[PDB]
């Protein structure tokens, strides 16, 4: 199958600089033109550069013109995307795409038929910091017909992301992870939330497990229940 | 580069029944007698993958309900029939200049319209102890995702203080969940008295109103 893999993402502050690249297999990489494609939290995909299999044509949109720089190596299978003069809106995830050129009866046409995984680059000032993991617990507030709504506030952390369990994955039911917020502070900010029946507050212990690799932390919390 | 508008940005389908999508274009895609605008359909947890091709030709795979129309600037991606499977954003593409993109269509599932229950989390000790203090409004399965929530505190209107985050539709409900965390310090924590989220929604008969008095649990 084709498999492309993007590495370089990471951390990064405004105005600095950093090379991504791109590894093709299950093809022949030489005969084919590829694409770099980026899409922002919250916002569609965009389209950043191009690059024929001999280099010798070559797009940019005007909002990476002049600062991204796109090459290719056919020896080594590989693509690559030099970003410049940074800024915190080139946050995104960073697609690489082959570019299939099919000549059909209807006419010629492109085919974005494969994308990596994608990496993350995050363009900021803040520094690493795991989050701090604060309980939503079940009270008088937590109103519901024999269920209870309890919940576990991860803030203040960077770079995205987090990952959240309950129980270490036992209780999957009714669990909801919020899409994180930048506060003004520059760190980020979930909540996760899971609704259980409220006559098993004092039966079960409800434990959230949050995990942020890139500040290596590892907290696991418990939500007990508030008897008012 | 060439602007790409698509409307509207959210269309709720019911199963069975036809949906369309429009794209406009800053100038003329024609040329030639072809139209160069191609249409990009991305599922839930799911690669890009090409529904048409030069205005109006369906990719191979594609089936009869995707149909696109339309020349110039005005183009047009028609589905005679939405299934289930069909959810995810669609995208319009220029291929005069390569490459651009529009701002993407999102097609949700329509369904009927459900109330949100609403609870309210006071700041942990934990937190307290730490100078700062947070309160967790939650919208838990409501329908549409149209919802105002106003943080009030001693009855006085806040803003510029919350933040607000809404969940991915339901894959099985259909349905939607929001949270408003609102963030004070610790000593304009202990100067208020009353702190209520206000929320508007038309699965209510009226603005529900849920609050909680600091000290208490």
């Known amino acids: 199958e084709v498999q492309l893999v993007e590495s370089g993402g990471g951390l990064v502050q405004p105005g600095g600089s950093l090379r991504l690249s791109c590894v093709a297999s299950?093809?022949?990489?030489?005969?084919?033109?590829m694409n770099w494609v980026r899409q922002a939290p919250g916002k569609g995909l965009e389209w950043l550069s191009y690059?024929?299999?001999?280099?010798?044509?070559?797009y940019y949109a005007d909002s990476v013109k002049g600062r991204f720089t796109i090459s290719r190596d056919n020896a080594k299978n590989s693509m690559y995307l030099q970003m410049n003069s940074l800024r915190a809106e080139d946050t995104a995830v960073y697609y690489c795409?082959?570019?299939?050129?099919?000549?059909?009866?209807?006419?010629?046409?492109?085919?974005?038929?494969?994308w990596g995984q994608g990496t993350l680059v995050t363009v900021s000032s803040a520094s690493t910091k795991g989050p701090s993991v604060f309980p939503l617990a079940p009270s008088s507030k937590s109103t519901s017909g024999g269920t209870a709504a309890l919940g576990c506030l991860v803030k203040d952390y960077f770079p995205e992301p987090v990952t959240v369990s309950w129980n270490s994955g036992a209780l999957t039911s009714g669990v909801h992870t919020f899409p994180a917020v930048l506060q003004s502070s520059g760190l980020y900010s979930l909540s996760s939330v899971v609704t259980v029946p409220s006559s098993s507050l004092g039966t079960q212990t409800y434990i959230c497990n949050v995990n942020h690799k890139p500040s290596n932390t590892k907290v696991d919390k418990k939500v007990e229940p508030k008897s008012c | 580069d060439i602007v790409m508008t698509q409307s509207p940005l959210s269309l709720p389908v019911t199963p069975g029944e036809p949906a369309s999508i429009s794209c406009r274009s800053s100038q003329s895609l024609l040329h030639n007698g072809y139209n160069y605008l191609d249409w990009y359909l991305q599922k839930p947890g799911q690669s890009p993958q090409l529904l048409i091709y030069?205005?109006?030709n369906r990719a191979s795979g594609v089936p009869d309900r995707f149909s696109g129309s339309g020349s110039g600037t005005d183009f047009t991606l028609k589905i005679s029939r939405v299934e289930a499977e069909d959810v995810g954003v669609y995208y319009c593409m220029q291929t005069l200049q390569p490459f651009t993109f529009g701002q993407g269509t999102r097609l949700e599932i329509k369904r009927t319209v459900a109330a949100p229950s609403v609870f309210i989390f006071p700041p942990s000790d934990e937190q307290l102890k730490s100078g700062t203090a947070s309160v967790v409004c939650l919208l838990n399965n409501f329908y549409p995702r149209e919802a105002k929530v106003q943080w009030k505190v001693d009855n006085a209107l806040q803003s510029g203080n919350s933040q607000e985050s809404v969940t991915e539709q339901d894959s099985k409900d259909s349905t939607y969940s929001l949270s408003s965390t609102l963030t004070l310090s610790k000593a304009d924590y202990e100067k208020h008295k009353v702190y209520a989220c206000e929320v508007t929604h038309q699965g209510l008969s009226s603005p529900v109103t849920k609050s909680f008095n600091r000290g208490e649990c």
């Open positions: 795409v082959r570019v299939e050129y099919y000549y059909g009866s209807s006419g010629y046409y492109y085919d974005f038929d494969s």
């Open positions: 690059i024929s299999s001999s280099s010798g044509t070559i």
């Open positions: 299950g093809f022949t990489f030489s005969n084919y033109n």
């Open positions: 030069l205005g109006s």
